[PDB]
Amino acid sequence: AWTQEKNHHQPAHLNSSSLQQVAEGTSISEMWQNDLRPLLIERYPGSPGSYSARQHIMQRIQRLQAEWVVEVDTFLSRTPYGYRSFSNIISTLNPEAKRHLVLACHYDSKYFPRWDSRVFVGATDSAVPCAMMLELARALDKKLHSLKDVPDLSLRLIFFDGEEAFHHWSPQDSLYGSRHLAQKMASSPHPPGSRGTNQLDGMDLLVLLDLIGAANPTFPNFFPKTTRWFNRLQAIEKELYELGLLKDHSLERKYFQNFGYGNIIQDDHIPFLRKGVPVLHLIASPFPEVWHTMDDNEENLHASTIDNLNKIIQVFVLEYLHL
Numbered sequence: 001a002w003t004q005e006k007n008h009h010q011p012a013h014l015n016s017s018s019l020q021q022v023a024e025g026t027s028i029s030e031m032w033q034n035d036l037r038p039l040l041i042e043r044y045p046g047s048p049g050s051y052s053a054r055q056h057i058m059q060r061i062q063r064l065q066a067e068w069v070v071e072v073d074t075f076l077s078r079t080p081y082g083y084r085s086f087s088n089i090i091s092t093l094n095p096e097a098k099r100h101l102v103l104a105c106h107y108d109s110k111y112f113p114r115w116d117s118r119v120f121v122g123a124t125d126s127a128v129p130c131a132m133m134l135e136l137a138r139a140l141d142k143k144l145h146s147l148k149d150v151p152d153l154s155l156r157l158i159f160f161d162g163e164e165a166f167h168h169w170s171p172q173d174s175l176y177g178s179r180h181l182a183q184k185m186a187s188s189p190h191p192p193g194s195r196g197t198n199q200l201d202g203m204d205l206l207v208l209l210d211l212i213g214a215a216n217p218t219f220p221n222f223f224p225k226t227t228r229w230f231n232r233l234q235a236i237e238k239e240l241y242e243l244g245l246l247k248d249h250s251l252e253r254k255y256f257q258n259f260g261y262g263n264i265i266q267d268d269h270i271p272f273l274r275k276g277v278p279v280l281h282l283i284a285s286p287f288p289e290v291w292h293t294m295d296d297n298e299e300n301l302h303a304s305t306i307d308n309l310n311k312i313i314q315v316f317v318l319e320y321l322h323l
């Protein structure tokens with residue numbers, strides 16, 4: 001049986017001709033204004049916000065001509081203030097297929113106390129992620145639809161709710177969603193019901209994205225596990241600025257750069273990675289120079305980036321999936 005095939009996969013590099021067509025088949029002003037901004041509001045749990053968002057998504061997907069199958073995992077937990085609810089979102093093309101490329105932001109904000117009209121939002125941290133993840137199945141829509149035949153392998157999106165700790169980051173004041181997804185992924189098997197094959201077996205990669213939207217970032221590579229793939233972003237990022245599908249960018253300041261090895265950063269990803277899942281963690285390091293200050297907004301953003309960085313994986317994602 002499969003479960004071990006996951007670790008043989010290598011991609012289909014396309015050519016310029018194609019490489020052109022969807023460096024132009026993406027508009028980061030379309031993203032800015034349909035996907036992104038109408039999330040720029042306070043969207044941590046309990047909040048009127050944690051719905052205007054959640055909901056916002058849902059149709060943002062399904063409105064699409066491709067093939068998504070959308071699930072709200074929702075549950076009740078221990079907040080250092082009591083028993084708030086939580087709502088993980090789970091987009092899915094080909095559910096029956098049984099190995100998946102998946103991308104996954106945190107869809108919530110930080111709670112921040114209320115002493116004036118000003119209020120947190122989190123641009124970079126992190127609606128920017130989700131926003132691309134949204135671009136990323138718009139732009140390449142029908143390419144994604146073109147696969148109903150129907151080996152087993154497709155595309156899961158995930159939006160974790162409860163990235164952050166209320167008062168105080170801890171092993172048990174944080175990640176709420178993430179963890180609750182693991183032993184729920186783990187519990188349940190697909191095939192339904194292939195005995196020693198649950199949901200955590202078909203998770204092919206996991207490219208978690210956080211802190212995305214500053215000028216001039218740098219992403220380590222943490223897990224050699226998945227750096228063979230990191231190599232793809234070495235690779236994409238050059239066969240590419242060369243041909244100049246890249247604005248306001250040079251390769252003597254690369255962000256997909258290789259040295260920050262086996263390092264102590266703790267997102268939503270840890271407990272997945274801790275059923276040995278191969279995970280890929282991508283996250284301006286050092287942190288956007290405004291992280292969490294009230295100043296984590298539009299202002300200090302930068303189209304360019306997001307974008308360029310929006311293409312890029314809209315290749316990898318392919319590649320992987322033999323387009």
Ligand SMILES: *[C@@H]1O[C@H](CO)[C@@H](O[C@@H]2O[C@H](CO)[C@@H](O)[C@H](O)[C@H]2NC(C)=O)[C@H](O)[C@H]1NC(C)=O
Nearest residue numbers: 012013014015016017018019020021318322323
């Ligand atoms: C770029 O790659 C594609 C193949 O992925 C080439 O065009 C395709 O070629 C075959 C014809 O049998 C089919 O896969 C498609 O019908 C073609 N169309 C499209 C739209 O991709 C294309 O010629 C290659 N470009 C080069 C080599 O410059």
Ligand SMILES: [Zn+2]
Nearest residue numbers: 110125164292
């Ligand atoms: Zn944060």
